[PDB]
Design an enzyme around this catalytic site. Structure first.
Site, short mmCIF file in Angstrom:
data_model
loop_
_atom_site.label_atom_id
_atom_site.label_comp_id
_atom_site.label_asym_id
_atom_site.label_seq_id
_atom_site.Cartn_x
_atom_site.Cartn_y
_atom_site.Cartn_z
N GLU A 126 0.81 -1.21 0.00
CA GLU A 126 0.00 0.00 0.00
C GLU A 126 0.85 1.27 0.00
O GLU A 126 0.37 2.33 0.44
CB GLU A 126 -0.95 -0.01 1.19
CG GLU A 126 -2.05 -1.07 1.09
CD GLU A 126 -2.91 -1.14 2.33
OE1 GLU A 126 -2.41 -1.56 3.40
OE2 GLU A 126 -4.10 -0.77 2.25
N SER A 143 -5.98 -2.92 1.17
CA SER A 143 -6.32 -2.52 -0.19
C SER A 143 -6.56 -3.72 -1.10
O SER A 143 -6.27 -3.68 -2.30
CB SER A 143 -5.23 -1.62 -0.80
OG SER A 143 -5.13 -0.40 -0.10
N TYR A 167 -9.44 2.44 -5.98
CA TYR A 167 -8.67 3.66 -6.18
C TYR A 167 -8.75 4.23 -7.59
O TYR A 167 -8.23 5.33 -7.81
CB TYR A 167 -7.20 3.42 -5.80
CG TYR A 167 -7.07 2.85 -4.40
CD1 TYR A 167 -7.36 3.62 -3.29
CD2 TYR A 167 -6.69 1.52 -4.20
CE1 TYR A 167 -7.26 3.10 -2.01
CE2 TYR A 167 -6.59 1.00 -2.93
CZ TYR A 167 -6.87 1.79 -1.84
OH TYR A 167 -6.77 1.28 -0.57
N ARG A 171 -12.02 2.91 10.69
CA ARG A 171 -13.13 2.66 9.78
C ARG A 171 -13.51 1.20 9.92
O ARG A 171 -12.67 0.32 9.75
CB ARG A 171 -12.77 3.00 8.33
CG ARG A 171 -14.01 3.15 7.44
CD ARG A 171 -13.68 3.18 5.96
NE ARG A 171 -13.34 1.86 5.45
CZ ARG A 171 -12.13 1.51 5.02
NH1 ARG A 171 -11.15 2.40 5.04
NH2 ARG A 171 -11.91 0.29 4.56
N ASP A 198 -15.67 -1.96 8.66
CA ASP A 198 -16.35 -2.51 7.49
C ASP A 198 -17.27 -3.65 7.91
O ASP A 198 -16.90 -4.49 8.73
CB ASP A 198 -15.33 -3.00 6.46
CG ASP A 198 -14.43 -1.89 5.96
OD1 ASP A 198 -14.61 -0.73 6.39
OD2 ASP A 198 -13.54 -2.17 5.13
N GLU A 218 -13.86 -6.26 9.02
CA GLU A 218 -12.55 -5.96 9.57
C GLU A 218 -12.59 -4.59 10.23
O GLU A 218 -13.62 -3.91 10.22
CB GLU A 218 -11.46 -6.01 8.50
CG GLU A 218 -11.65 -4.95 7.42
CD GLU A 218 -10.35 -4.58 6.73
OE1 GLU A 218 -9.28 -4.99 7.21
OE2 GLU A 218 -10.41 -3.88 5.69
N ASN A 257 -9.98 -1.08 10.39
CA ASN A 257 -8.79 -0.42 9.86
C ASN A 257 -8.47 0.78 10.74
O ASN A 257 -9.25 1.73 10.82
CB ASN A 257 -9.01 0.00 8.40
CG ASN A 257 -9.33 -1.18 7.50
OD1 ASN A 257 -8.44 -1.95 7.13
ND2 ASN A 257 -10.60 -1.33 7.14
N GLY A 275 -7.75 4.94 4.67
CA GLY A 275 -7.27 5.78 3.59
C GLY A 275 -7.91 7.16 3.63
O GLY A 275 -9.05 7.34 4.06
N1 LIG Z 1 -16.36 -13.23 3.38
C1 LIG Z 1 -16.55 -12.39 2.33
N2 LIG Z 1 -17.70 -12.40 1.62
C2 LIG Z 1 -17.89 -11.56 0.58
N3 LIG Z 1 -16.97 -10.67 0.16
C3 LIG Z 1 -15.78 -10.56 0.78
C4 LIG Z 1 -15.49 -11.44 1.92
N4 LIG Z 1 -14.26 -11.13 2.35
C5 LIG Z 1 -13.79 -10.14 1.54
N5 LIG Z 1 -14.69 -9.80 0.61
C6 LIG Z 1 -14.51 -8.77 -0.44
O1 LIG Z 1 -13.13 -8.40 -0.50
C7 LIG Z 1 -12.97 -7.01 -0.21
C8 LIG Z 1 -11.73 -6.79 0.64
O2 LIG Z 1 -11.85 -7.50 1.86
P1 LIG Z 1 -11.06 -6.94 3.15
O3 LIG Z 1 -11.82 -5.74 3.66
O4 LIG Z 1 -10.75 -8.09 4.07
O5 LIG Z 1 -9.72 -6.41 2.43
P2 LIG Z 1 -8.79 -5.24 3.02
O6 LIG Z 1 -7.48 -5.35 2.28
O7 LIG Z 1 -8.82 -5.27 4.53
O8 LIG Z 1 -9.53 -3.92 2.49
P3 LIG Z 1 -9.26 -2.44 3.08
O9 LIG Z 1 -8.74 -1.68 1.89
O10 LIG Z 1 -10.62 -1.99 3.56
O11 LIG Z 1 -8.23 -2.64 4.17
C9 LIG Z 1 -14.23 -6.58 0.51
O12 LIG Z 1 -14.56 -5.22 0.24
C10 LIG Z 1 -15.28 -7.53 -0.03
O13 LIG Z 1 -15.88 -6.96 -1.19
MG LIG Z 2 -12.15 -3.60 3.93
MG LIG Z 3 -8.31 -3.59 5.82
RB LIG Z 4 -7.18 -4.13 9.18
#
Ligand SMILES: Nc1ncnc2c1ncn2[C@@H]1O[C@H](COP(=O)(O)OP(=O)(O)OP(=O)(O)O)[C@@H](O)[C@H]1O
Ligand SMILES: [Mg+2]
Ligand SMILES: [Mg+2]
Ligand SMILES: [Rb+]
Ligand SMILES: Nc1ncnc2c1ncn2[C@@H]1O[C@H](COP(=O)(O)OP(=O)(O)OP(=O)(O)O)[C@@H](O)[C@H]1O
Ligand SMILES: [Mg+2]
Ligand SMILES: [Mg+2]
Ligand SMILES: [Rb+]
Ligand SMILES: [Rb+]
Ligand SMILES: [Rb+]
Lengths: 324, 326
Positions: free
Chosen positions: B15, B161, B231, B270, B272, B284, B286, B290
């Site tokens: 990232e 991301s 992004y 944030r 989610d 999750e 964060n 961002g």
């Molecule tokens: N169990 C699930 N069921 C459906 N979609 C999922 C699941 N896990 C992840 N996703 C999809 O993958 C995307 C990223 O998941 P996650 O939030 O774990 O990634 P991240 O790298 O933590 O993202 P961020 O940029 O918010 O840190 C989510 O926005 C969602 O659309």
């Molecule tokens: Mg996320």
């Molecule tokens: Mg995350």
């Molecule tokens: Rb996280």
């Protein structure tokens, strides 16, 4: 080629214990090793000032403010021997990560979780590891303890039994919390096990560790407190612990499970309680003591791993993880 | 203005470029005199005018000063770590700032490390009674044991991301997805995929008494909310407030503040969520969200009556009121 930098002392209440641990490590480590001391004021002592502070068994004040003008490039492995807050809780580990140096022991996440008695119990209870009933109390908030006394009140980040009180009545809870809040902003209140047998097992390895034989601590004090832990002759270690055959294997399996779940690297001493035939995991210590009365070197000595070989493998595990 | 803030952006995580985009957004609105320090992708730091030059390039592959950098830390009252992912959001930089004695924005060491680990954070949330998606942790070089059926979502345990995340449809595709996730971490998670799903997000602001922003919703046309969708401008549909009935939005805010306290977060976060068949699941947390032009966190609080400069000002004040509380 191998030159080790040993860091001891620190700002935690375990400052003196850390210097005693450094004495034990320097006496048996098979590599050339230099000592750096963190004084109780946070300032560092290097070179002969560090060895002088080691002889005094206490360093109230230091010379160099953080970060120290230390020649980091001269060392291949850093051995943090800082028990407690700002040494065992991921803070120093975070600095060594950005530094790029291989270092002995658990990483940032495992160090921070194992030092928080509340957070570690949350993870272990969810993973199916038996733990004593407990609640967390934040400084300034009214405690709510949904079980009968006796209690054990602890700072969440404590070590060497510092700030721990055995509470027999509700009217003595406020004084015990005030004592605990001198060392941490969060406290834990645990259900006291009475009577209780205390078991300890050492783990060596990265994530997938190997377990030492199980040892049992015996003493005559009301509980395994600071004076009992570091006064010679007060604590007996029975090794191997007198346990039924199925219990010894269960203790070792629970220790390796908690070790893997928390992602610990290097080493840990996992403490257990045995009450009415039931096992409870007390805590994990990612930087156990190496004092003359400490149990971690003696656990692995009975497992065939001599003191110099134990320290050799710790440094070796630090480089194994550094090379992925 | 006598207040002086040090902004740290970049980093060695995947990232790195996202962090520089967040730096441009924060520097544009922060009401304090702020200096930028960039951590290049090779780990070495860029200071002064060289940091602003790397900010324009939106990428810094090589730096000048090895860590620890020759930075005049005493000139700054608060440090703002804007590093997403590993070696920035996981408690490493926080530990360094703790030893420096500088007040800093965001969660402490323990909360940053816990919230960056998708496996350990889910364990703590599940133990506290927060609903989470069924999952299992898979470590490098260890055969996977998944007690549920695909579709899966395979992620590195410390990813951000959507880097290294794969949507798995058949069990034969699991080994390829885990091999991709193991390129970024020694531990991976295998989560049960929710389909169809609505993605809800809510920001939190505060140390002891966290307050929630309005609930927002993200909609897109991609198979999942991936790096390109997150992004690329215009690719994601950011709905604030979320087109839900008020009862569900209040339940989202209540779960966010509960998870905020359970995980011990400080400063900002944030949260989610997943909404599938009327059931809420916490995805999750964060701790360093961002501040990219397409990011949700500053927009969520903008709709809540907290303007962009006011949001950053309160982040700096919260860093000072925690440090004084020790
Ligand atoms: N169990 C699930 N069921 C459906 N979609 C999922 C699941 N896990 C992840 N996703 C999809 O993958 C995307 C990223 O998941 P996650 O939030 O774990 O990634 P991240 O790298 O933590 O993202 P961020 O940029 O918010 O840190 C989510 O926005 C969602 O659309
Ligand atoms: Mg996320
Ligand atoms: Mg995350
Ligand atoms: Rb996280
Ligand atoms: N729930 C309990 N029931 C009975 N005794 C307890 C309980 N909790 C703590 N004790 C007693 O207090 C001692 C210290 O507890 P604990 O292991 O949590 O402290 P510590 O400071 O982490 O110790 P260490 O020096 O191993 O780090 C234990 O050895 C035990 O004798
Ligand atoms: Mg302990
Ligand atoms: Mg103990
Ligand atoms: Rb501990
Ligand atoms: Rb509990
Ligand atoms: Rb699980």
């Amino acid at each position: 080629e191998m030159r080790v930098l040993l860091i001891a002392g620190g700002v935690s209440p375990e400052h003196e214990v850390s210097l005693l641990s450094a004495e034990g490590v320097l006496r048996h480590i098979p590599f050339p090793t230099d000592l750096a001391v963190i004084a109780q004021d946070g300032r560092w002592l290097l070179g002969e000032k560090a060895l002088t502070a080691l002889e005094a068994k206490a360093a109230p004040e230091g010379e160099h403010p953080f970060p120290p003008p230390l020649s980091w490039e001269r060392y291949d492995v850093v051995f943090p021997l800082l028990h407690g807050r700002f040494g065992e809780d991921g803070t120093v580990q975070g600095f060594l990560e950005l530094l790029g140096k291989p270092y002995v022991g658990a990483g940032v996440a495992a160090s921070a979780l194992c030092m928080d008695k509340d957070l570690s119990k949350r993870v272990l209870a969810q993973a199916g590891v038996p733990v004593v009933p407990w609640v967390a109390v934040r400084k300034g908030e009214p405690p709510v303890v949904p079980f009968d006394p006796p209690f054990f009140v602890k700072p969440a980040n404590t070590g060497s039994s510092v700030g721990i009180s055995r509470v027999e009545r509700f009217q003595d809870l406020e004084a015990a919390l005030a004592l605990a809040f001198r060392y941490d902003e969060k406290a834990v209140v645990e259900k006291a096990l009475s009577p209780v047998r205390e078991l300890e097992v050492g783990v060596l390895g990265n994530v997938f560790g190997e377990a030492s034989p199980v040892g049992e601590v015996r003493y005559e004090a009301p509980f395994y407190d600071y004076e009992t832990k570091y006064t010679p002759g007060r604590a007996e270690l029975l090794i191997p612990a007198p346990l039924d055959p199925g219990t010894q294997e269960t203790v070792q399996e629970l220790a390796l499970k908690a070790y893997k779940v928390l992602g610990v690297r290097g080493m840990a001493r996992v403490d257990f309680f045995l009450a009415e035939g039931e096992l409870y995991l007390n805590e994990l210590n990612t930087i156990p003591g190496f004092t003359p009365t400490s149990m971690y070197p003696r656990l692995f000595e009975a497992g065939g791993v001599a003191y110099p070989e134990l320290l050799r493998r710790l440094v070796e595990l630090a480089l194994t993880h550094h090379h992925h």
